[PDB]
């Protein structure tokens, strides 16, 4: 909640692009999180039956 220039200034152009940077990286990190999982055991036979 810090958009405090409150006018058409380059700061609010700079501030919101920073927010774009962190959320895209949060997207791509969890995109890599469901990608690079070579672990399969399913449930080691216990919960699967």
């Amino acid at each position: 909640p810090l958009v405090t220039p409150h006018t058409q200034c380059r700061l609010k152009l700079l501030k919101l692009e920073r927010i774009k940077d962190y959320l895209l990286m949060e997207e791509e990190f969890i995109r890599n999180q469901e990608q690079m999982k070579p672990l399969e055991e399913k449930q080691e036979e216990e919960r699967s039956k």
């Binding site: 200034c9 380059r10 920073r18 990286m25 791509e28 990190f29 690079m36 672990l39």
Partner: protein, 889 residues
Amino acid sequence: MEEGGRDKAPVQPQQSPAAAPGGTDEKPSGKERRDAGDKDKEQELSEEDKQLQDELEMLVERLGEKDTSLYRPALEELRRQIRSSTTSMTSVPKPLKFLRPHYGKLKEIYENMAPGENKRFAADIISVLAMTMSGERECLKYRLVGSQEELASWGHEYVRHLAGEVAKEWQELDDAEKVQREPLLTLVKEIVPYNMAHNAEHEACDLLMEIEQVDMLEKDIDENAYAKVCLYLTSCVNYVPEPENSALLRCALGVFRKFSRFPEALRLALMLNDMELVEDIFTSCKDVVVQKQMAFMLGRHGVFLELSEDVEEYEDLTEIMSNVQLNSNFLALARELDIMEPKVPDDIYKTHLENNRFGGSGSQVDSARMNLASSFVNGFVNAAFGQDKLLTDDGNKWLYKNKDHGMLSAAASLGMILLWDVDGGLTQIDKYLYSSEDYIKSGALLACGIVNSGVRNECDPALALLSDYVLHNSNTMRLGSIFGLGLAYAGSNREDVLTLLLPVMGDSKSSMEVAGVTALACGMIAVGSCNGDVTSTILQTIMEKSETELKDTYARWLPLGLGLNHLGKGEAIEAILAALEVVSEPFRSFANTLVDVCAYAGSGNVLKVQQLLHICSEHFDSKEKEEDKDKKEKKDKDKKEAPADMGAHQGVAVLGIALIAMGEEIGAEMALRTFGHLLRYGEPTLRRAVPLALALISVSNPRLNILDTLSKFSHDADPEVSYNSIFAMGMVGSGTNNARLAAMLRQLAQYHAKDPNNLFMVRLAQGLTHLGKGTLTLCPYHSDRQLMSQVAVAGLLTVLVSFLDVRNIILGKSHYVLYGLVAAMQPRMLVTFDEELRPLPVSVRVGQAVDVVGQAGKPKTITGFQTHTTPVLLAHGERAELATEEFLP
């Protein structure tokens, strides 16, 4: 819909420019005079910015666009006056003649020939005529020219002075908030050659105003809060001479060009330190310029003020060095015994009184490792003159009872009892020194470095602890002697005792923990030069760590002093230096992420933060490089604590979801030390998010991982109501959460929040945002703990006395010569004002009202009234000078 009947302008300027090809040839007068009658009238129907709808500007081009395509090029015999009538009349509607690919063709009408002095018909109009159109030129057209071809044609040559007079025109017409539009213009034009734009805009600002400097002045540093590496390199040194040349506010030099010390050049701020020694004006601004130069952002300045004026103008140096340090001791002596302080509270241990009736009876806890935490009822509360004769008898018995590492620990607590002391601090140690034991003297003489820490005067540069070190043939005499003196001289960058303690590294006496803290001792000293330290560390690193694949005593201590010797520069040469120096196996390439990001303390360099994720993200990694992904996450913790809360909300959003949610060894072992590194203020967002993963202990792991996250959950200073969490978790933490392992720890967490009533500033932010370190002194501890087995033996050197850079506490004292004033200060929740109406009310929390030594708190820019002017630096800093003037009736 009342159209028709009064459509004069959609008819006669529909016909006369349509008759302009009918009257260019064979009508030399009608080509010129109807053009001039078109030009001034279309100019007149735009100058009032109270009719945006112009009866020509979007009425004529419906045929006039195809007309101008056949009038301007196809004439081919353009005179010297008819180009000044065509281009002055037809370059006006072209942002609205053309659609969004206007960006390549703001020139096919205009830059045929720019007619004369285009602001002559664009002076009183703000941006409707051409000033928005001028920004459209500098956005796309100049950037494609000035991408690689800055030194170029008319698109640069006249465009320089064209942007010069336009940037004068923003502070000419109305002098509104379009002042800040000039950095919007100066930075979009030639982004990397900003200084080549700014050098003309520096001298233009020097002759612009002396009242309309300050909001543009803070506009620069708000844009300098985060940028690219080169933009933060450029606009910060453009920021320097504006209170030096235009105005002479000039007391914002020392700390706010410590902004510009490490990025541009270390000698450049030393030339600004020379610019301090030029403007020696009176004394009052000079006093508080040099108040910060000792123990607010750096020391090591005691060699440049012993020149030819050693009477009072250069005899402030030792006054800065240790006397106002001792006047700060007179704060904790006089003022803080007055507010709320007798010599021993000693009763946070006694606050565990009601537990003995909670569930029947008590007196069941007899664990011997609790007696380690029993030293901190005496230890932490006695900082800032908690001097104790015979109140150390709980120490005196337990020193002579058992627990050799606690014999070192209780002896090391005496340096915390007498902190910031030079007067009689060694005399307190000497009676508790001569016991002729290894552990007693190695803790006490390490604590002697803690006593004279921050003094850096003549106490013992090689007197006491160098003689303690050459006693070595054995245990912690070999270890505990080099640590305290490098702790005391951490603020200095002296070369001599660094070369005295470099044969500690060159001895190759293979005591591993001694060589590890040797890197930590030399790391606290220097941050810049002496590449031979980097040579000396990697020699024994290649000798020892290559012939092993084992514990992090190698890894947590030896590359860390490398990162401390190269902290805080985003040049990315230090990564080329260090990583190509230790090209090696991956367990030695654990050190790849250390010196990479230790040079990356704080900025916006998001391209590093993605390579801080994308290389070693998860991989599931069956127990091979799990330390490296923890240490890669360790370097995510910094570059987050300085972007002044812009990325702190994003840091707690990512690291709450991504790791502790969908992680493994990265999240559920180590990723809580962010919150033990991001802030120490405390707020119930993260203070309640940690017991979401702590009340759920998740005991299946070696739970002291999660109980390490218990420990520095209480790494938030400024004492609070957080006792509700710790005491209630201590109640479930006595029986369950085994007292064999963490009964020291929970009470270490309990007793650290109320360290002392005051002196909680350990959070690397001075004035408004500058670092002033604490980094070289803190970051060894969070590098020390992220495992185990240092809760018993080795980390007891660290866990007591790791971080010792606490720089006083509040901004109450007045110092007006005799030090008698107290004034009227008015404390509030901090500023939000960025650009609003004129006198921007600085803060919002008017309720609190004190006079004198009142607290700092989390967001407090405390102001004052009653016409005392407070004309010192107008940016605070806890040793204000406060002159007196009242010429307003």
